[PDB]
Design a protein around this ligand. Structure first.
Ligand SMILES: [Cl-]
Ligand SMILES: [Cl-]
Ligand SMILES: [Cl-]
Ligand SMILES: [Cl-]
Lengths: 297, 297
């Protein structure tokens, strides 16, 4: 047999591109963009329309969102294709950046740092700047420069942890920013639950906005399970953090408050059984993508 | 602020490569390979060992597997790194190939077409030999020659899951860990059961393999949930197909039978609530990788 191992490009990294966006003091951003496989490698959709999903912590979520959509688009070729826009950082040894703490937390009149369990201060309060950046710089670049011949129908924002907090902040203060908000394991605990002040202002008061929200969390986030290889004290640290952060109950209570207000067009909460803060990312992102695609019909 | 956009490569598609493997009767294969972000761009692990996960339907699963691992590896730098090897096809407009039907189904003396929709079938022994004797030695001896591989896993979904079970039952020493997601146990009037029975009672006295198996399925696979838009007839057709395939019960009963055999050192079955045949892929793949990483701690 004439076996040949021939290097090829792009392989599975098809119909994706990346840009650095330089200007901010903190350093450049990295945007990763992917588009449907039926479109050309130059991004030509041949007159087709699209939806779009914007991801914060872009480096950690881009590929999962891309592939989830490509599986579904393969099964359902008549469905509207979705462009993925991941907003992240020029990082090489990891998929998370410490810069996320500033970018994803909203500015507040008073600040209480997170617990390490000593106080663990980090940069904070840049969410309004970041949201402006996405809406006024990134989004128009994608729509007007990258895909000028594509009519964009539905837009979504997904974030996990501080990303979920960011998604909630966007919903409560600028509800027309996106059509759909996907807040996965949102850090509702953050800064003595300051996001609930914004939630209640949103519940009270934005006339022309009909937002959709999907909340999610892993069942183990508030109720951790000791791993096979884990020391007693390291497990007890996780128990401490879990009880303070109150992920499961904070999500369910926020869901209940928002549901009772009737201010959302559609609202859903999903508990992912047996998933923890890290392991829930894949299922919650996949689930958010499916939730988004199911809104089309 | 004067934002400066500039194209960059590779963006989030770093530490990955692809080869076309030509020679086989049916046509060329495409293998996509990714490795940890802490290793070099040329695949140098600097003496580190690794696990490996081999994926069938490679075009549809490569990026999800890759990114799931990179998220975990970023939080757990001391854990054993994992190389992803996706075995797929040179396809451009979709992530699935019709060739999968032949490659993933085992040879049988009689064939019953699935409900009637006949397909090419019976190439799984040839495909397993290809993976074991052509692909794996290329990856281990040519791509990662100084990496000592600890545990190797095989993941497949649907017909891929059937393939994973076929591999386990006929050549149990092929892989250390088998991840059979929504396996098509129903296929060809449950013809896989003949091999399952032989496996159960066929262990050698000395030096027999005791592999690891994880079974999974989505709760909606056997119990579909009606959509608003669906007619009665269209929903009834989905219910009929679900009853026939019997995904949930076949998985659970295979688990029970294999548990009683005592041939597997570790055996797990997971039902993913609210997930269907397509939506369970991400969660089951992520869950399978978590499972492999947990047993490698
Ligand atoms: Cl846990
Ligand atoms: Cl949509
Ligand atoms: Cl269903
Ligand atoms: Cl384990």
């Amino acid at each position: 047999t004439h076996w040949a191992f021939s290097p090829i490009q792009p392989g599975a990294a098809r119909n994706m591109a990346a840009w650095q966006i330089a200007g901010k003091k903190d350093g450049p951003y990295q945007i990763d963009v992917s588009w449907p496989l039926t479109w050309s490698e130059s991004g030509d959709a041949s007159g087709k329309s699209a939806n779009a999903v914007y991801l914060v912590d872009g480096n950690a979520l881009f590929l999962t969102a891309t592939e989830t959509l490509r599986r579904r688009e393969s099964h359902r070729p008549s469905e509207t294709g979705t462009v993925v826009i991941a907003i992240g950082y020029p990082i090489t040894d990891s998929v998370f950046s410490p810069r996320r703490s500033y970018d994803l937390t909203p500015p507040c009149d008073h600040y209480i740092p997170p617990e390490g369990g000593s106080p663990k201060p980090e940069a904070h309060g840049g969410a309004d700047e970041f949201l402006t950046f996405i809406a006024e710089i990134v989004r128009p670049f994608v729509e007007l420069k990258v895909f000028p011949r594509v009519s964009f129908g539905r837009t979504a924002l997904f974030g996990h942890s501080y990303g979920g907090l960011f998604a909630l902040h966007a919903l409560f203060t600028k509800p027309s920013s996106f059509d759909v908000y996907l807040a996965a394991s949102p850090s509702i605990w953050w800064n003595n639950r300051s996001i609930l002040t914004e939630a209640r202002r949103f519940i009270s008061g934005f006339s022309s906005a009909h937002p959709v929200l999907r909340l999610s969390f892993g069942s183990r986030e508030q109720y951790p399970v000791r791993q096979r290889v884990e020391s007693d004290e390291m497990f007890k640290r996780r128990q401490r953090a879990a009880e303070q952060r109150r992920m499961n109950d904070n999500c369910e209570e926020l869901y209940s408050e928002l549901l009772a207000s009737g201010r959302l067009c559609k609202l859903e909460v999903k508990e992912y059984l047996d998933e923890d803060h890290g392991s829930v990312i894949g299922p919650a992102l996949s689930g958010g993508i499916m939730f988004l695609s199911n809104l089309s019909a």
